[PDB]
Design an enzyme around this catalytic site. Structure first.
Site, short mmCIF file in Angstrom:
data_model
loop_
_atom_site.label_atom_id
_atom_site.label_comp_id
_atom_site.label_asym_id
_atom_site.label_seq_id
_atom_site.Cartn_x
_atom_site.Cartn_y
_atom_site.Cartn_z
N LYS A 10 0.83 -1.21 0.00
CA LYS A 10 0.00 0.00 0.00
C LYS A 10 0.86 1.26 0.00
O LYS A 10 2.06 1.17 0.29
CB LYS A 10 -1.03 0.00 1.15
CG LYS A 10 -0.48 0.34 2.54
CD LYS A 10 -1.60 0.72 3.53
CE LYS A 10 -1.99 2.18 3.51
NZ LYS A 10 -1.03 3.01 4.28
N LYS A 15 7.84 1.04 0.37
CA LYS A 15 8.35 0.33 -0.83
C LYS A 15 9.62 0.97 -1.43
O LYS A 15 10.60 0.28 -1.66
CB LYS A 15 7.30 0.19 -1.94
CG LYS A 15 6.04 -0.57 -1.58
CD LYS A 15 5.05 -0.57 -2.79
CE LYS A 15 4.45 0.78 -3.15
NZ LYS A 15 3.75 1.42 -1.99
N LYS A 41 3.73 8.23 -8.38
CA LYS A 41 4.42 9.20 -7.51
C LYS A 41 5.80 9.53 -8.07
O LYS A 41 6.30 10.63 -7.89
CB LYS A 41 4.48 8.74 -6.05
CG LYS A 41 4.70 9.89 -5.07
CD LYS A 41 4.81 9.34 -3.65
CE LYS A 41 5.27 10.40 -2.71
NZ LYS A 41 6.34 9.89 -1.83
N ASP A 129 -2.15 -0.33 -3.93
CA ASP A 129 -3.48 0.00 -3.39
C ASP A 129 -4.61 -0.60 -4.24
O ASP A 129 -5.71 -0.88 -3.75
CB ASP A 129 -3.66 1.52 -3.28
CG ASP A 129 -2.48 2.15 -2.58
OD1 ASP A 129 -1.48 2.44 -3.26
OD2 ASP A 129 -2.53 2.28 -1.32
N1 LIG Z 1 12.38 1.78 8.00
C1 LIG Z 1 12.03 3.07 7.93
N2 LIG Z 1 12.40 3.89 8.94
C2 LIG Z 1 12.04 5.18 8.89
N3 LIG Z 1 11.33 5.82 7.95
C3 LIG Z 1 10.97 4.98 6.97
C4 LIG Z 1 11.28 3.63 6.88
N4 LIG Z 1 10.76 3.09 5.71
C5 LIG Z 1 10.15 4.10 5.14
N5 LIG Z 1 10.23 5.27 5.86
C6 LIG Z 1 9.59 6.55 5.54
O1 LIG Z 1 8.22 6.31 5.26
C7 LIG Z 1 7.75 7.25 4.26
C8 LIG Z 1 7.08 6.52 3.13
O2 LIG Z 1 8.01 5.59 2.53
P1 LIG Z 1 8.14 5.28 0.97
O3 LIG Z 1 9.28 4.30 0.77
O4 LIG Z 1 8.20 6.53 0.16
O5 LIG Z 1 6.78 4.48 0.75
P2 LIG Z 1 6.01 3.93 -0.53
O6 LIG Z 1 6.97 3.96 -1.72
O7 LIG Z 1 5.52 2.56 -0.19
O8 LIG Z 1 4.87 4.93 -0.87
C9 LIG Z 1 8.95 8.13 3.90
O9 LIG Z 1 8.87 9.34 4.64
C10 LIG Z 1 10.14 7.27 4.31
O10 LIG Z 1 11.26 8.05 4.69
MG LIG Z 2 7.27 4.78 -3.48
#
Ligand SMILES: Nc1ncnc2c1ncn2[C@@H]1O[C@H](COP(=O)(O)OP(=O)(O)O)[C@@H](O)[C@H]1O
Ligand SMILES: [Mg+2]
Ligand SMILES: Nc1ncnc2c1ncn2[C@@H]1O[C@H](COP(=O)(O)OP(=O)(O)O)[C@@H](O)[C@H]1O
Ligand code: SF4
Ligand SMILES: [Mg+2]
Lengths: 276, 274
Positions: A10, A15, A41, A129
């Site tokens: 999600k 990811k 995104k 999602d």
């Molecule tokens: N292990 C982690 N520790 C701290 N922050 C994290 C961790 N994994 C992800 N984040 C934070 O969570 C948020 C969303 O992560 P993101 O990888 O961009 O998600 P997605 O690609 O699934 O939408 C970001 O602000 C990222 O820095």
């Molecule tokens: Mg992403």
């Protein structure tokens, strides 16, 4: 020797952070990797490239007036550790199918021979999602043989994980797409690791790794980098190295047995996250 | 006299919890309103009907083998305060278009004239992680004239809000679809209200209301709305305040979406270290 993987889950589950960091650990270990962003995104490669956001296949196609006129150098960029980066992009909100850029990008990369002989891994970072159109395409069209689902102890993350598993089941006869495991990205919740290990067992997979919540991630990302590059000596850098190593060594690739909504609720009730 | 509205936002942001409570307040104020659930999770009417899950338009059409063989009676249900409930549903994960149930449901309701003479409002509870197919239909096909967005101080919730705005802009010249405002659903974050008020100002809209995080919501849901479970609760007044503000609304704009750099600038300014 080339292994094609996809990271689903999600929105906001982790990811892109997880993929770029694990890929940076693979490159660090001498593996030749390509990341194909499959999320509108379009920030799935920014930590490898140190960019604000990479020009997508859709943007370049629109700018050029044709996908056919494009060459690999218009869309493919090399970043940290020699990692190759492509961003699919998608149409503007409200227009067409949000996943159509995924189909366009993957077909273009295949036609242009982006999947070179030296490549050890390809990782698709896919919006999870909804599992339809271009987002279901890596599964439906047998593009990623190993699926790893990023999730957490939250209902919506578990529900999304279980829906991706349903997609894998649906196309099990059509190709060799299998579920490799669940990646628990910590939300600092009590018994979260136990809940995801139980969900994994219920649906016939494994929780391949538990990624802790660490502020070093935010510190690296504000500088447009992975933890592996920002602080290679950090504890979190070893967590991504362990995840990368476990994906390389993984041999458990299954046709999952998705849970019912009642079973997802039963799991959350048992681990305290839900009322009876 | 009929006003058609839509509630958008990312998955798990609180869309269904907000909707079923603001509409409940409209019904208790004597307004005739119908909720059309436009999310594959299909638990958008769950509380007003006091059911575990309403039989969706997709399930009933699949069960009948055709939309032509489907009846209004086995898709539309009346719950709390005489509120009419329709759940669109969606196909199985990995198959077809996740928003297909929305197109099928809206076209069926129109053909069946479910938009009766006595109806004052129609609220679509739309999935907002993607703005395409059936999820973009209420905007693209001029079905809902007033749009509203449930968000929080989280990047993904704000990013989702900003794309909904882009969708509205794209079809502004095709019909009368407009953005009414943002609804902040609290995640108990410091300066979260200021952040959403700033995001609202940035894109040319308003933060119509701030919904606090309350345990009474979980107590009610364990399978009814807050106004049904505890109408005297503080949280029940929060949703009542929201209902008053949507009817009294006339701020329906063509938004000016922010860039990703602007979304990051906002979060950096208000957001706090974990
Ligand atoms: N292990 C982690 N520790 C701290 N922050 C994290 C961790 N994994 C992800 N984040 C934070 O969570 C948020 C969303 O992560 P993101 O990888 O961009 O998600 P997605 O690609 O699934 O939408 C970001 O602000 C990222 O820095
Ligand atoms: Mg992403
Ligand atoms: N204001 C609130 N206070 C407490 N819990 C809330 C509130 N709004 C929503 N929730 C909870 O948040 C979760 C997700 O909300 P839901 O309305 O189902 O989200 P969505 O429909 O956007 O996916 C549920 O567990 C619900 O009880
Ligand atoms: S298939 Fe999925 S991504 Fe494409 S329009 Fe339908 S819901 Fe949107
Ligand atoms: Mg909902």
């Amino acid at each position: 020797a080339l292994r094609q993987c996809a990271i689903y889950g999600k929105g906001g589950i982790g990811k892109s952070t997880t993929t770029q960091n694990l890929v940076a650990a693979l490159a660090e270990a001498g593996k030749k990797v390509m990341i194909v962003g499959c999320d509108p995104k379009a920030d799935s490669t920014r930590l490898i490239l140190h960019s604000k956001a990479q020009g997508t296949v859709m943007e370049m196609a629109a700018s050029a007036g044709s996908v056919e006129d494009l060459e690999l150098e218009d869309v493919l960029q090399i970043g940290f550790g020699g990692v190759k980066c492509v961003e699919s992009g998608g149409p503007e909100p409200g227009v067409g199918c949000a996943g159509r850029g995924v189909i366009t990008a993957i077909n273009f990369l295949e036609e242009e021979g982006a999947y070179s002989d030296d490549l050890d891994f390809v990782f698709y970072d896919v919006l999870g999602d909804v599992v339809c159109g271009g987002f279901a395409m890596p599964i439906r069209e047998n593009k990623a043989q190993e699926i790893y689902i990023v999730c957490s102890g939250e209902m919506m993350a578990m529900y999304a994980a279980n829906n991706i598993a349903k997609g894998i089941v649906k196309y099990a006869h059509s190709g060799s797409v299998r579920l490799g495991g669940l990646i628990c990205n910590s939300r600092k919740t009590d018994r979260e690791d136990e809940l995801i290990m139980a969900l994994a067992a219920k649906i016939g997979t494994q929780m391949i790794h538990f990624v802790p919540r660490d502020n070093v991630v935010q510190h690296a990302e504000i500088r447009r980098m992975t933890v592996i590059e920002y602080d290679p000596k950090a504890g979190q850098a070893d967590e991504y190295r362990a995840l990368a190593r476990k994906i390389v060594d993984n041999k458990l690739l299954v046709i999952p047995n998705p849970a019912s909504m009642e079973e997802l609720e039963e799991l959350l009730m048992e681990f305290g996250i839900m009322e009876v």
